Symmetry: C4
Subunit: 233 residues, 4 copies
């Protein structure tokens, strides 16, 4: 099938929906549930979370799912099997703590050339990709052929999130490598994004999509009990 992969850059709001493929799977990441409307609908094929907040994102997702704000078929931890990037003890026992989730690296490492590319530039040059690229890589490994990009921009101030994380060339070069090496097609869904300097626009299909508005929704990350943190540590 087709996949729309979203970062959560301002252009997430600036999709041209006449270009929306209309049968598609959706990939979301990180604080996607901060969106003020369902810019891509409620149903995700995969959501992707950074290893350093995976424990709190998983807890929050289960609340979104049960509160019926979103559904997802897959839950990914966006890992790389590198000690300087993530806690290895957590990776080793992951499937036992989170039996319905997946380490993204099980799919990422299937792209041997891109994994080699990524590693070489990160270890030796400190060049890092964003979730939106990691997601294209996992999407390619999953067998997707047409990938439609949105919310990727170059380049939220919620209380809980601020308390846990008090915090382009690389991306475009990576995305080009992927496209060139694996022979899939990349499209750009956001004409007013800088991504559109670099990526061929999704074609107009005069498609429609209803953007449902969100009211009384979850717009910050949840924080587990101390006793939960004690178990996980």
């Amino acid at each position: 099938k087709k996949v729309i992969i979203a970062g959560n850059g301002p252009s997430l709001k600036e999709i041209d929906y006449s270009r929306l493929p209309n049968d598609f799977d959706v990939f979301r990441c990180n604080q996607f549930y901060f969106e003020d409307k369902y810019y891509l609908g409620k149903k995700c094929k995969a959501v992707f979370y950074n290893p350093s907040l995976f424990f709190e994102q998983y807890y929050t997702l289960k609340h979104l799912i049960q509160n019926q704000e979103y559904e997802t078929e897959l839950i990914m931890c966006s890992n790389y099997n590198q000690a300087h990037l993530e806690n290895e003890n957590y990776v080793k026992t992951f499937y036992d703590y989170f039996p319905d989730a997946h380490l993204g690296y099980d799919f990422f490492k299937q792209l041997k050339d891109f994994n080699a590319y990524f590693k070489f530039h990160e270890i030796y040059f400190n060049q890092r990709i964003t979730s939106g690229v990691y997601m294209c890589a996992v999407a390619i490994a999953l067998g997707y052929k047409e990938i439609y990009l949105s919310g990727i921009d170059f380049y939220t101030k919620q209380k809980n999130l601020l308390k846990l994380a008090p915090n382009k060339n690389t991306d475009i070069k990576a995305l080009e490598f992927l496209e060139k090496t694996y022979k899939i097609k990349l499209y750009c869904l956001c004409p007013n994004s800088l991504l559109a300097n670099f990526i061929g626009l999704a074609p107009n299909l005069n498609s429609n999509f209803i953007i449902q508005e969100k009211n009384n929704y979850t717009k910050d990350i949840l924080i587990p009990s101390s006793e939960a943190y004690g178990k996980f540590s």
Copy 2:
């Protein structure tokens, strides 16, 4: 086949045997051999022991077997692959210390949805299931379709046991999840149990069963030599 799973609640004594399936396998747990009579016969399909007393239960079982008080085809350690719940070094080398036994988690983890369910509520909410649920989960993973419950109540003071261990909604919710998710049937064999507020009675078959009385039997856990403990540590 059919399985009767027993906890050792007071209702173990209060089975309505007219409802007993009459070809069945039996699952027992923990201090089941404290029973003052053979309420389910001598022959077990599986006995299940908590990891923290597994070393002393295994020793005791071998004595029951050789003293011909009980037989069992399988011996399970009821583990979960969680550091805060059990000693991981012991899990890793288990099959070498106990080559005729099984880690229950090899079967429990086959129920991906229930394992996810269990983990999420235990890690984040401190909700724990009892052996009787763990046993239904292992029974489902083993391919059983009709499961008859007894000795589960909501919710023994022997010397050796006291020296080693100086010591419902969750259960009913778990059992419902299992039944709903795996499409097996749960029956209740003890009409006078609270379990019967929640679980459909096993149907009357006017079956008979002989309850053999126990005399001069093993009714406390055995304690290994110090030298045995030294090896195991």
Copy 3:
């Protein structure tokens, strides 16, 4: 095929060779090369060494092989996968230090019932079997059906050996368990041994065997250089 398994008890010298099967494989152990004559010939199917002297026995064997005193097809380390019995780091990397050798436990653990039997009595009762039983167990796992025993007695004072190691019911019970459980046949080749109180004599076949005498032979264990010991530590 048939196997003769030898301990190195006095009865090794007291074989009745009229009873020798005449097509057979030979299992030897430990300081077998101390024999003053080739009581079973030069050609071994397997030699078995205790883990605690495996490094010095392997070194010595390679010298026997190259000095053409003995040949062997297999080299076994007689291990059990138990921390209190052997060094586990050495077991883990064994095949990399000794790529032409085998951990005996890879075959021993194939006899699930005997492994369970062994473990239970050793861990809990401190009952240990001798190499001659370990060898029957490995021989059974290897597919042998007729096993002829010698040099097992119930129940050498060389310089190097003394410097490295300054040092029955269980056996007979184990051997009986093996015979009963795996349905192989045990024979006794040494009529004047106590083993013959317990084991059915190999039948007379009026077979002949030449006992070659040994002259100028290796009759103590060799000791590796310090630098070798430094690597191995």
Copy 4:
């Protein structure tokens, strides 16, 4: 196919190219890119690097590849799975740091007899082989039948290299073992080498080969940033 394996001894310059097989794969090692001319062409089937400089050779190779000085299909780390010879933590996570490279030991250990041979003499006698032998062993494991040797001599002073590494019978005996045991053929391409006392000359085929000269080339090992070293440590 045929393989030319090169060490980088003086005889690398002294190939008799009339004897060059003319369809062949090339194996290079270590500081091969110091060559002042393309004595074997630019295209390598495999390059092999010692584990202790693998991090800096890999970085340097990627620069050679991108600077179009050389191409290679395979990148090998010449390891042995021995703690005293290499860092084991690095071996364990190798494929994640270097996803397009290979541990040479995955192929070397396929030659069970040679691996046994190597280990026995190194651990116990401190006899070590050179890269050129390690390379023949990997070449045999890879399915090569005819192996043409060069740059092996019995038995560079660049700044970066000097800063990282401030630094025959065994070889000939090993090469003979390989030839004898695996039934491949060894040839010698350098008539004026001592190797030719021991190895049958590649036959004259009056073949031609163009030796391209090298100008403005990479002739020392590159040194990664500190921050790269920090990640890798």
